[PDB]
RNA sequence: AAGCUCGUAUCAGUUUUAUGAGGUAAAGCGAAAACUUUAAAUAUGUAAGAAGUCCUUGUUUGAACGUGGACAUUUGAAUGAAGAGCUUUUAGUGGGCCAUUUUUGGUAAGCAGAACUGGCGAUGCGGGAUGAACCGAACGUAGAGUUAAGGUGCCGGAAUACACGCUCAUCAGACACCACAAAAGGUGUUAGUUCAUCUAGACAGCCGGACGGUGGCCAUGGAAGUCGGAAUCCGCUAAGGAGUGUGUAACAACUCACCGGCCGAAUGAACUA
RNA sequence: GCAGUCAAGCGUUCAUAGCGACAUUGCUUUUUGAUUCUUCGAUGUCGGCUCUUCCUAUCAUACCGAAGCAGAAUUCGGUAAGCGUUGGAUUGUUCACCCACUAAUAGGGAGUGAGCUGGGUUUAGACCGUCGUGAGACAGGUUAGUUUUACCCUACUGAU
């Protein structure tokens, strides 16, 4: 599905002698706001001990693009405990936005790796400015001066069950 | 299986003079057409053998001279094993060695027949197999 | 091979140079 | 490649490779030396029997003579004008080009121009360049030597170099009982002309190396001086 | 990095030696105590100058 | 890694001159004519200028790639063929049997027999391939010489006269007999 | 062993340049049943009589065995599983002596079978040790030392036994 | 099944609350992990009021028993519910399979013993091509509408839908799978991860160099780096082994190793999927 | 097999806490081709005539590859199941062997207990041995000893 962005925050619960923790904050990337609470409690075990019954959520947001028109540039950091221990991994997608840019790579983890929506961890997702610091092949493909390039074997979907032409590449 | 002291233990265990006093004993077992042993008394039977050898068997010449140096591609030998002494002396031994080769084609002639059905070109027959009676598993 | 990477170190001095600070004074 | 790759022939030898510091042992050497002297000559000096860069070196154990890469030595004179170790130096690292072959001293300036004018060797025919010299091998039997002695002299070349000759000399052979038979005169090059690479090596086999080799040198600096002084001598 | 990251290991490694060093003395110096226990005190303080010479 | 195009550039002389639709070349010059098919092979030419042309493959693969550099080397192989030209120079050396060699021509097929070879009594043709010319090599024994346009129409006629003296069920150390490629050259000679 | 050269007890002088708690090793061996180890041999001619029984399994006999009568026997120690040499090594000193067996005390899985000298995995067996030259304090040499067999003699025809030291 | 003996506010394959115990180790930190308090879930017991309590102050100051009096329903957590016991009588059926969960003991490998709960039997129905145990599913008779599990090239009802990647198989795969052959092999591909190298110009190829002591010692018909035996070093060096191979009867010659030129810009290695 | 050894890796981090691929040592009768004649309990029934078909894990024939492969002959290997693959002697037994022919005498599967049989289902008869007091049973051994379809459906071959 088509995630979103989100900023959450929660604060465990104020006790007596021990008011106003220290309000813990995340961006999470997910399809709407009940998975993201749900994978929000998963990494503040991971991080300390923290436990869901022990806190509360203080806030959650929906994070928009600030330029969804522009192109940009993305730097991934991708860990996961995969087969024996895990193992970073840094891919670079050229996009559009912050949530498109995740998409694909859920769509190639489980391509290449089987990897599952829990096997990931999203450690950060830089956005690259400056042209030449894009280190990855195929990015830099993209990026020469004034692109050109073909489409070669244009076929045209047929809407009936026939036709009559010998229908030709076009072209 | 428990554990326990024993096993672990020493068992069957010999007295030491004694076997100087079997060592002796195995020459004067004389024995009798009359009597038959009944009962072995177990003892150490390989500690009370070695009687008095006297030929010491041959050295293992593998040990100095192993395959590959002694012949080959490799062959780190060159000069004979013990690459015997004198030339009149080689020229006699040798001499003997002709004639007991013939000797035995002289003798070994009488015992043939052999070789003269194979020019004949005909083989006896087969061994009946009554005679093989039994010698049957 | 990440590009924003140096920033990173500093980012792990300044959260513990409070740190050997804070536990004492 | 994810596969179908070329692989390396895996080896067993003693020398490693040197690898950079050898490369920063030059370049702190010479600019060791630079200061040192006085009189540098940069010597142009293609191809040459190691044991005459042995003579040369023991021609006098006074000076210092250094051999290297030209990119070494270049970035160790200095190339840009700005990029120097010493001054006025960027005009003649500009200047050596080939193989080089440079050289301190502290010798008499008439005396190191004589000396190389004085001194020529034999050597090798070595190819794109013309050697006087033709050979048509004789008809029948090859010999070590190649003909240039009477034939009673020498030994006919071993059969067990022949292919060599039959498939990267080009030559046609045969053997009958080993000594190796040809069939016609069969000349090689002819004189005054430029010699091919499979030409220059059948002289190499035979060991026919009338062909004189001398160094050249153009420039020439002075430290007190700091003066660039060129002259081309061959 | 490489001189941030030993500096990160070597504490951890210096430990090593003071932490564990902090145990087999006070492991050794709880052995003769319990040895202390049954025989003798003036057998095991003895004992204890006969440790101390070697 | 989907490269998105490739170009190679082929280097056209002054003499010769090409032609090329869909996927057929015709090459034309000094020595005669050289065709050859390529609709298996799903490349893109263009003329740039008279001399050069680049050939293309866009958006594919290294299956698709590695197809794309080999194309450059047919058609220079065809441009070299009507320039210099292609020679095979073959040797047969016999121990004991002097090997005949003969062309013949069985019903204008032109055929090479080998006659006595290894003291046979078969003898055995090779059929000339179109376009190739083979000639008995004068004033240097025992040599034969076989000269063509096209690369492999001299060499697999060179190959299968090889391939049809070969010496069996025997040790290959001892007898030695058989036709052999001796030298391979161009027709010129000079360039 | 090429970069290794890349880089670069105590027997006496008439021995050098030559060369070479209390519990068992193994106690808990699997159990082995009562009606396997027994094929049940049918006698008569109508084979309909069985009442004999065939020990399955590898055997120490004795040494005056001499087969007993026909009418009497009841159990069978069939002549191709006697095992009488065992192959013995020894924890230490790395040597396996091939060695004759003198009798089995400690067999698990019955006490039967200790008087029935059944070969299993586990048996504790006693071994002549004349060749090793074991000497006693008090230098009367031992020739008898238990050792437990190791392997299971069914599913090979060697039994290696291990002595107890 | 027959009944009157209840149509009371009494119960429950359930939690909460307190109290338990296995502290499993995770706080943590103390006095020099050695605390002794304490922090969770994993399944489990016990208890949660009307005969309920106090007071009166006797019996045999306490306690164990008592006389008597006072304290009503926000009457003593949640949630669901008129079906709890009686007296009578009395049909069938008592040996069996499968799965999960712990737990103990195991070995070629299968397992074996317990405890617990499911399913099966006696039970159709949709699906899994077909099936005692798989997935779904509350069996009167019909109509309409919506779904489950599973599907939607053609048998076959339903998108030859859309979207991104990967894969070519000389018996691919479409699944029993998180198991068995199974640990690896492969100049098949794809994506990584770490190490190195590089305009003081790598990588690949041509070109040239690749030497003096020195034919290093014994060794032997001859062994010059190259049948072997052991040593294995200095000089000179840009770099060159007391030698990678090929080769000779020995030499030669070639090779590589390492330099150097030419070329011009990326590349190697080892892993992981 | 059993007991080691070595160690590329593995190990919660990891050498040193352990596993551990690949290698490797323990004797398994003598170092001098002399022997060595060693047969040690198959409790379960098949063998065999006639005839078909399949498998390839190939003996021959076809093609090749490799070898001190000179030839000649042979070994090892790859493709390959197209077609080949016997006659006998021997039951004091053959869970086989020998001797001969031949290109070669390859190995199997679905077997052929209603196609026929020989041994063995195997009943009463009898003898010997073993055991039992006996009737009898058997560690055995020996001999004699009746099941008898087809015309039906289908398959199959021929026929209208």
Same mark, same amino acid.
């Given at each position: ?171 | ?13 010999? %007295? ?107 083989? %006896? ?10 010698? %049957?598993? | ?25 | ?61 006074? @000076? ?5 890469? =030209? ?54 025919? =070595? ?102 002084? @060129?002259?081309?001598?061959? | ?16 030696? $003071? ?19 049954? $025989? ?6 003895? $004992? ?7 | ?191 | ?8 007890? /105590? ?20 159990? !082995? ?7 049940? !041999? ?12 065939? !020990? ?29 040499? /065992? ?15 003198? /009798? ?62």
């Amino acid at each position: 599905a088509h995630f979103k962005e989100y900023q959450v925050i929660g604060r465990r619960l104020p006790t007596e002698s021990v008011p106003e923790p220290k309000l813990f904050r995340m961006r999470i990337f997910a399809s709407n706001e009940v998975i993201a609470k749900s994978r929000y409690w998963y990494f503040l075990q991971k991080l300390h001990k923290v436990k869901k019954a022990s806190g509360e959520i203080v806030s959650i947001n929906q994070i928009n693009e600030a330029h969804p028109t522009k192109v940009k540039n993305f730097g991934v950091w991708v860990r996961y405990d995969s087969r024996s221990g895990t193992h970073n991994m840094y891919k670079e997608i050229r996009d559009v936005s912050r949530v498109a840019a995740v998409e694909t790579l859920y769509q190639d983890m489980a391509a290449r790796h089987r990897a599952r929506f829990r096997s990931i961890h999203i450690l950060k997702v830089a956005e690259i400015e400056k042209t030449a610091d894009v280190k990855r092949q195929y990015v830099k493909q993209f990026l020469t001066k004034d692109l050109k390039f073909p489409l070669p074997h244009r076929v045209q979907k047929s809407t009936k069950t026939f036709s009559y032409k010998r229908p030709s590449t076009f072209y | 299986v428990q554990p326990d002291r024993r096993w672990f233990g020493n068992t069957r265990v010999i %007295s030491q003079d004694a076997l100087q006093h079997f060592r002796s004993a195995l020459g004067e077992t004389q024995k009798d057409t009359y009597q038959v042993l009944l009962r072995r008394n177990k003892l150490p039977m390989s500690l009370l053998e070695e009687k008095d050898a006297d030929e010491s068997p041959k050295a293992r010449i593998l040990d100095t001279e192993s395959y590959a140096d002694a012949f080959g591609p490799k062959a780190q030998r060159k000069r004979p094993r013990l690459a015997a002494s004198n030339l009149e002396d080689l020229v006699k031994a040798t001499n003997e060695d002709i004639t007991k080769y013939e000797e035995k084609q002289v003798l070994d002639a009488t015992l043939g027949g052999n070789q003269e059905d194979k020019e004949n070109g005909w083989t %006896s027959a087969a061994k009946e197999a009554i005679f093989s009676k039994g010698q %049957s598993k | 091979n990440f590009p924003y990477k140096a920033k990173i170190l500093e980012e792990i001095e300044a959260k513990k140079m409070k740190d050997l600070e804070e536990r004492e004074l | 490649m994810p596969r179908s790759k070329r692989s390396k022939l895996v080896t067993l030898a003693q020398t490693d490779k040197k690898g950079r510091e050898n490369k920063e042992r030059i370049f702190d050497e010479v600019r060791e030396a630079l200061d040192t002297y006085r009189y540098v000559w940069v010597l142009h000096l293609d191809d040459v029997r190691t044991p005459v860069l042995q003579e040369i070196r023991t021609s006098w154990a006074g @000076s210092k003579l250094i051999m290297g890469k =030209r990119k070494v030595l270049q970035k160790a004179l200095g190339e840009k004008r700005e990029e120097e170790y010493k001054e006025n130096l960027y005009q003649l690292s500009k200047l050596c080009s080939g193989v080089t072959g440079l050289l301190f001293t502290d010798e008499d300036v008439n005396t190191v121009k004589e000396y190389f004018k004085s001194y020529v060797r034999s050597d090798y025919s =070595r190819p794109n360049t013309k050697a006087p010299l033709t050979f048509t091998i004789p008809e029948g039997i090859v010999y070590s030597r190649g003909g240039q002695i009477p034939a009673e002299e020498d030994v006919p070349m071993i059969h067990s170099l022949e292919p060599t000759m039959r498939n990267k000399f080009e030559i046609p052979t045969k053997i009958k009982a080993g000594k190796i038979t040809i069939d016609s005169p069969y000349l090689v090059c002819t004189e005054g002309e430029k010699l091919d690479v499979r030409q220059a090596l059948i002289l190499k086999q035979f060991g026919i190396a009338a062909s004189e080799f001398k160094v050249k040198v153009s420039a020439y600096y002075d430290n007190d001086s700091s003066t660039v002084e @060129s002259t081309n001598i061959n | 990095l490489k001189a941030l990251k030993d500096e990160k290991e070597e504490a951890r490694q210096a430990k090593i030696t $003071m932490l564990k060093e902090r145990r087999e003395k006070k492991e050794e110096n709880e052995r003769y105590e319990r040895l202390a226990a049954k $025989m003798h005190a003036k057998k095991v303080e003895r $004992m204890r100058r006969r440790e101390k010479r070697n | 890694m989907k490269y998105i195009q490739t170009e190679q550039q082929i280097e056209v002389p002054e003499g010769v001159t090409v032609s090329i639709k869909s996927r057929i070349v015709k090459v034309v010059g000094p020595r005669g004519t050289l065709t050859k098919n390529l609709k298996h092979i799903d490349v893109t030419f263009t003329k740039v200028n008279n001399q050069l042309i680049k050939v293309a493959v866009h958006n594919g693969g290294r299956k698709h790639v590695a197809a794309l550099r080999t194309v450059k080397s047919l058609v220079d192989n065809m441009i070299t063929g009507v320039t210099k030209g292609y020679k095979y120079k073959m040797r047969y050396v016999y121990a004991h049997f002097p090997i005949n060699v003969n062309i013949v021509e069985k019903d204008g097929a032109k055929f090479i027999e080998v006659r006595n070879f290894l003291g046979d009594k078969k003898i055995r043709n090779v059929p000339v391939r179109d376009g190739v010319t083979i000639e008995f090599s004068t004033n240097v024994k025992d040599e034969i010489v076989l000269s063509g346009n096209s690369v492999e129409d001299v060499s697999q006629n060179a190959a299968d006269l090889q391939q049809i003296c070969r010496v069996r069920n025997k040790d290959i150390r001892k007898f030695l007999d058989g036709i052999y490629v001796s030298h391979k050259g161009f027709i010129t000679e000079d360039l | 062993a090429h970069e290794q050269s890349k880089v670069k007890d /105590a027997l006496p002088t008439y021995l050098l340049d030559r060369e070479q708690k209390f519990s068992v090793p193994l106690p808990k061996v699997r159990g !082995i049943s009562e009606e396997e180890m027994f094929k049940v !041999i049918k006698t008569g001619k109508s084979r309909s009589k069985s009442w004999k029984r065939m !020990i399955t399994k590898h055997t120490f006999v004795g040494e005056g065995f001499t087969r007993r009568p026909v009418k009497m026997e009841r159990i069978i120690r069939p002549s191709a599983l006697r095992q009488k040499k /065992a192959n013995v090594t020894h924890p230490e000193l790395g040597v396996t002596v091939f060695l004759p067996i003198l /009798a089995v005390k400690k067999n698990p899985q019955s006490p039967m079978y200790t008087q029935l000298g059944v070969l299993t995995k586990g048996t504790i067996i006693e071994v002549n040790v004349s060749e090793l030259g074991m000497v006693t304090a008090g230098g009367k040499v031992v020739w008898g030392k238990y050792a437990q067999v190791t392997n299971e003699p069914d599913r090979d025809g060697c039994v290696n036994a291990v002595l107890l030291v």
